Structures are given as structure tokens and as C-alpha cells.
């Protein structure tokens, strides 16, 4: 009968909110975005700093 | 060193809208923050490409490795047995290492260590200065690379920097004279990071890149131990010949079984 | 909250085009930066340093470690890497690119090839990306990419 | 009687580390043994013996 | 798979830490010297971690039954050498898994 | 079996059922042979007899 079915677990077909029943969702929700860290920088006082 | 963005007009109403992003500080940030890096981790391939090789001439036991400070090798480790009474020889050697730099510069003896993650764990996990064979958790120094890479003070002495993409457990020391001259590499910025933009007509799509100039330069008794200078008029950039494996304000020793 | 979700990754790539296959990222907290992409490796390529390939003082040359990243190696003694054997089945699978490597990292140990960098010469610097009538020198760009990852709840 | 009950198990991007590129710009989060199997980067196991 | 290429100590098994293993355990002759020597392998794990991962060194630990209590009958800190009663950790499972704070 | 769990041939894993299949479940939209898994319990006793 009326069955909300599911997605089949494809990366497309979640993306997209396509199912195998009747309703069809909008959208996976947004659960925010992760960035890469900035790698530290090994000081200049282990040298000369004379400017030119 | 240069670098050019040229990002689009589509992407930035779009990535505006959809994310919240700016995608004009990004790539800015991102070309700001690449060329420091390069240069950060120019400065440091220098140091660790002019060191000598540590532990021969005067810092070696009769033999042991000549090279090498092997954690299982009975000679190197003072005949130590258990663990808290063997990470304590690896302070004396260290130590044996400042005073041979300090003879050959005659400016002072070394005072920054640049090591790999486990031989700056090793010092961490261990009771350093006068005291009974112990050993436990690094709690001392910051061994962690994300938070910042400054291990600490060792001893009081030693300033420990950490090497991030170290290929081999090895540490380097180095001494720094309180005048900016006595280094044994001089690092010299011409011009800072100016910025430049344009727009090409037949697309109006914005282009954006960077320009910087620098320059690098080493001590002239960077070869302490030959007693005349090459030419006379001689290039203080570095090559094969007045740094590799000669400079003297730089030891360098890898460090096996740990 | 929802049947599904979404999780965005942002990543910034070396080199023109960022969905371009064989990109690398560019902040890797493994791989190490590429210290020679806005200098001296903006000017001229360099010969990747591979299995049986006979160095020669002064040359430098490229390889891409698989847990430390891009490295610049200026060898100074004459040797082929290839020493010992080729390949052939010297451990256990250890696939060719751990044995490259740590024949490279056994040259290093023993004061061969040394980890070098440098920037660009001011006579290329100055006409970069065309000028004065110069050609095919175009600099080195930087780009962004974003991906998405989903999950779909079960029961 | 009976009992039901949803959930969703993810992993985090970047947990590959050694990859530096996803596959298809459009990935399966859930884990999977091509995705995740002794490659997340954030858990390492070791083993004891001789207790 | 821990316990492998820059946490491995060259000779070992490549994944284990062995107690009759004078090498994993650094010539360690008695339980208040051998048990430290497990604190170390620990901690050059969580390390590693934070290179692999480029945003902290690990802060939390699954472990077996029996080798909580070991790290419980040992000197935590940094002394000289101590074992005996399993007392600043609980070992008990009924009570909660939760171990406790390790250092 | 101990051996080979060590050499990382054969891992724990646990996963849960998909939604499709979660909503047919012995009957519903017509679906057969698909059971659910049930729980019960039984109680003992013991005897003791008291000696002098």
C-alpha cells in the first residue's frame, strides 16, 4: 500500500532525495563543512632576519 | 616567487548564494598563506641540507657507529639496561654535540635543536637534569605538530623546534649568536607579499596574483676548518661547495631504534 | 533530523584546474608542501627521480614520498637506485612504491640526495605569463574544489 | 509487542588522509569496506600478548 | 594497523607489543620497569595520530580488559619505577566502562 | 579463527536493516517469507534440602 519507501542507498539518489515510494524528499540536510587546517610555520629564530 | 588566482565571476555569485563563502578571500588566502609556507620550509631545507654529519670526528666513542646514535647498541647507551636509565644517555650525547659546535665557530655552543616527532616524544618522556633513572608520559613538551611546532626549553639551554614532514627520526643543532650576523644562514626579505590585480576585457573575469623577492645568504666562516677563503670574491648563495654538509653552526645526527 | 545528510569537504589544489585528475592538495597535514611550485619549479620541469635512473652531481630531481609528500632532491655522488635488485620479490607484497622510497630514504641516510629548494631567477620572474616577447612561461595557479558526502539513516 | 528505532551511522571526509581527492564529487558517507576498512587515520589499534 | 611504519620499532612484530619481547620493552627486567615501557607505546601512537590527521594529538583509549588495569598498576608519571594494587583506575565493568582519566 | 582475526582477513562488523526492507516485515504491501527476530525469556528453580 502507501509505503514511504527509502532511497537505495546510492550516493546520486540521496543526493537527489529520489526514493522508491511515494513521497519524495527535498534534500539531505546541511550538517556544515570541514576545511583543511593551516600547518604552523617553524619560526625565523633559528637564523638571520637581515633585510636588504 | 609568484603566484596568479584568475577566478571567476559566475563562481563567486554562486558559492556566495549557495554556501555563504567569499571565493575572492579564499584564493587570497590561500595564495598568502602557500608562499609563506614555501619559504618557511625553504629556510629549514638549507639548515638540515648544510649540517654535519653528526656524531664523528670528536663527538664519537672509539667506535660505536660513526654516524648513527643507536638505541640498541651497547656502547652508544652508556651499558644502560632499562628503559628510564637508557633515554638518559640520549641527553648526554646531545650534549656532546654543543660543545664540538661551540669549537668550531668560537661564538658559543648550540642552543636550538630541530628534531623529528618520536626523538622530541623521547625527551618528553623522560626526567631531564639531575636526577634518578625515570621515565613516563610526555607531559614536559608539546610533541602535538597542529597546536604549534615549539616543543619547549630542554634543559634550560635548548630551544626544540619540530620537524613537520621529517622523513627519518634525526635531530639537528644549531646555534643562534645574539647578533643577527652570527646565524650560519641568513635569511634576507627584499620585498613583502604585493599583491596585483587585472581584469581582461574580452572576459571582465577577475585576475589576481602575488609577487614577493628574498634572499638567502650563509655566515662567511660558515667552513670553519679551512683557513682560507675560496676566491676571494665568492657567492654567499648556497650550492654544492661553501654549504653542503660543511656549515658549521649546524649538527645533524639520525637516531635509530626509536 | 532528516532521512538524510550532508557534509561538505573543502579542499585546495595544486595547479589550474581543480577537479583536474592527479591534483594534490595543497595544505596537506601529511604531504609537505611543494617548496619549489612557486619558484624555481615555475620556471623548469624537473626529472622525477624514479627505479634505475644514474643521477649526476648538481642535477635535481622530484619524487613524491607516500607518507611525507613532494620532495626536491639535488644528489651529489653519482649512483643508480636501483642497486641491489630491481624488484623482483625482495619482502612480503610491499608494493613498488614503499620499496622506491625507502631505497631513496636509505641515499638520503647515507649523504646522497639532500632535500633542497630554492626560488625563481629575476630573468624569468620578470616576463612570467608572457612579455617582451617571451612564450610559453605561464606561472603556476591555485584553485579550490568542494565535494559533498551523504548518509542515509537505517532501522 | 515490538520495538523500532532510525539511525545513521557517518564517517568524516579527510579520514583517508593518504587520498587527497575524493572519487565522484558526490560520495557514499556510510562506511563501506573499499571506503573504510584500516584506513581511517583516526583510530589506530594495537595488540597485546604475553599479559 | 597500528603499530607500523614510524611507530615501529625496527625487529618488532609489526602490529604487536609483546611483554617477552626484551626489544618492545626496551630491556625492562621487572613489571615496575616493563609496565612504563607500555605507557611509552601509547603515547607514540596519539602522536602519530596527530600527524595523520593534522588536528590533535588523540585523547581518548579502547582497551582490553586486563591491560586497563595493567596501566592501573603502574606509575603514571614520571618516576623511577612503582607497580602493585590496580588502584587509581576502576577495572570494574559492572560499574561503568568508563575507566577514568589516564595522566 | 583467533589467528586469522589478527592478520585482518576477518573483522567485527555490525550494520542495520534497510528501510525497505524495515517496513516490509511479514506482511505489509504484500511482501513474504521476511519474519521479524523475537525475545523471551524462562525462569528456573533450584531445590534445597536442609540437613542437621
Known amino acids: 500500500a502507501e509505503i514511504g519507501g527509502d532511497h537505495g542507498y546510492n550516493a546520486t539518489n540521496i543526493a537527489a532525495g529520489q526514493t522508491s515510494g511515494a513521497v519524495t524528499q527535498i534534500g539531505p540536510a546541511v550538517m556544515g563543512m570541514v576545511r583543511r587546517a593551516i600547518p604552523n610555520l617553524i619560526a625565523f629564530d633559528i637564523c638571520g632576519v637581515q633585510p636588504m | 616567487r609568484q603566484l596568479k588566482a584568475a577566478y571567476s565571476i559566475e563562481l563567486a555569485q554562486d558559492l556566495r548564494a549557495v554556501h555563504g563563502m567569499d571565493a575572492d578571500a579564499e584564493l587570497s588566502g590561500i595564495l598568502a598563506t602557500e608562499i609563506m609556507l614555501e619559504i618557511n620550509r625553504e629556510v629549514v631545507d638549507w639548515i638540515n641540507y648544510s649540517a654535519q654529519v653528526g656524531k664523528s670526528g670528536m663527538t664519537l ?143 571582465f573575469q577577475p585576475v589576481m596574483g602575488f609577487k614577493t623577492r628574498y634572499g638567502i645568504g650563509i655566515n662567511p666562516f660558515a667552513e670553519s676548518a679551512a683557513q682560507a677563503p675560496a676566491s676571494r670574491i665568492q657567492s654567499g648563495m648556497p650550492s654544492i661547495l661553501n654549504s653542503l654538509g660543511k656549515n658549521a653552526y649546524f649538527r645533524r645526527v639520525y637516531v635509530k631504534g626509536i | 533530523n532528516s532521512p538524510t545528510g550532508q557534509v561538505f569537504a573543502l579542499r585546495a589544489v595544486y595547479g589550474k584546474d581543480p577537479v ?16 619549489m611550485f612557486s619558484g624555481q619549479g615555475a620556471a623548469k620541469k624537473f626529472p622525477a627521480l624514479a627505479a634505475s635512473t644514474q643521477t649526476t ?86 584553485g579550490f574544489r568542494i565535494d559533498k558526502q551523504v548518509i542515509e539513516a537505517k532501522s
Not at chain 2, 661551540?102 to 626526567?127: H, M, P, Y
Not at chain 3, 644528489?75 to 623482483?88: N, R
Open chain 3, 57 to 142: 652531481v648538481g642535477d635535481i630531481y622530484t619524487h613524491f614520498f607516500q607518507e611525507t609528500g613532494t620532495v626536491y632532491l639535488q644528489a651529489s655522488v653519482q649512483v643508480t637506485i636501483d642497486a641491489g635488485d630491481e624488484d623482483e620479490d625482495e619482502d612480503e607484497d610491499a608494493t613498488d612504491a614503499a620499496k622506491l622510497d625507502a631505497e631513496i630514504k636509505k641515499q638520503m641516510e647515507a649523504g646522497a640526495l639532500v632535500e633542497i629548494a630554492e626560488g625563481m631567477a629575476t630573468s624569468i620572474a620578470e616576463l612570467q605569463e608572457g612579455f617582451n616577447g617571451s612564450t610559453d612561461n605561464p606561472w603556476n595557479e591555485m
Open chain 2, 61 to 203: 666513542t672509539p667506535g660505536s657507529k660513526a654516524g648513527v646514535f643507536d638505541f640498541q647498541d651497547p656502547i652508544d647507551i652508556r651499558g644502560a639496561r632499562w628503559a628510564g636509565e637508557s633515554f638518559k644517555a640520549l641527553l648526554f650525547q646531545i650534549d656532546k654535540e654543543a660543545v664540538e659546535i661551540a669549537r668550531q665557530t668560537g661564538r658559543g655552543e648550540g642552543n636550538f635543536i630541530i628534531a623529528s616527532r618520536n626523538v622530541v616524544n623521547v625527551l618528553a618522556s623522560v626526567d631531564t637534569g639531575i636526577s634518578y633513572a625515570a621515565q613516563g608520559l610526555a607531559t614536559g613538551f608539546s610533541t602535538d605538530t597542529t597546536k604549534s611546532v615549539f616543543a619547549g626549553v630542554l634543559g634550560g639551554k635548548y630551544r626544540v623546534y619540530i620537524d613537520q614532514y621529517a622523513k627519518q627520526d634525526y635531530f639537528t643543532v644549531g646555534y643562534k649568536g645574539p647578533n643577527e650576523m652570527d646565524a650560519g644562514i641568513y635569511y634576507a626579505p627584499y620585498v613583502a607579499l604585493t599583491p596585483l590585480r587585472g581584469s581582461d576585457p574580452k572576459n
Open chain 3, 20 to 35: 583536474a585528475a592527479g591534483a594534490k592538495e595543497a595544505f596537506h597535514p601529511m604531504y609537505g608542501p611543494d617548496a
